[PDB]
Nucleic acid binder design. Structure first.
Ligand SMILES: [Mg+2]
Length: 86
RNA sequence: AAAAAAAAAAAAAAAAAAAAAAAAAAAAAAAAAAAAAAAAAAAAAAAAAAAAAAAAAAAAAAAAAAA
């Protein structure tokens, strides 16, 4: 979401669910609260894949000087496998 | 006229040198002189002389998530 003050202050530009191919063990609804929303005909979302689209998006926002506020982001970036600098 | 075979098997043979009382020399200070198997027989590995071994390297984490 756009953390900058403006007309889209806090308005998302990404709310994307995962195009996941194989079987997923845990839904982790106590940790994530997914529907599961990772259905392709039952999207109810922009069910979008990382493969060069949104990984490029976050990578470019890393690249351009757009700092990433939020909570507990360190291990999040680890499980992403992005290495956001200091 | 003491005048002997002139060398197998790589045969085989020389030395390449001394107490010197020559003249009026006492009784081991040597540094130690020191042989036995063979009835189926003697039998260290680790790396081998402590002539001076202080020998607990602090700890504390109230706990996660990730709605
Ligand atoms: Mg958390």
């Amino acid at each position: 979401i756009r953390g900058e003050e403006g007309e889209l202050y806090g308005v998302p530009f990404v709310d994307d669910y995962v195009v996941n191919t194989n079987h997923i063990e845990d839904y982790l609804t106590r940790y994530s609260g997914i529907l599961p929303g990772d259905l392709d005909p039952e999207k109810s979302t922009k069910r979008l894949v990382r493969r060069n689209v949104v990984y490029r998006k976050v990578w470019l926002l890393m690249q351009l000087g757009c700092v990433f506020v939020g909570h507990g982001l360190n291990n999040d970036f680890k499980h992403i496998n992005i290495n956001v600098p200091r």
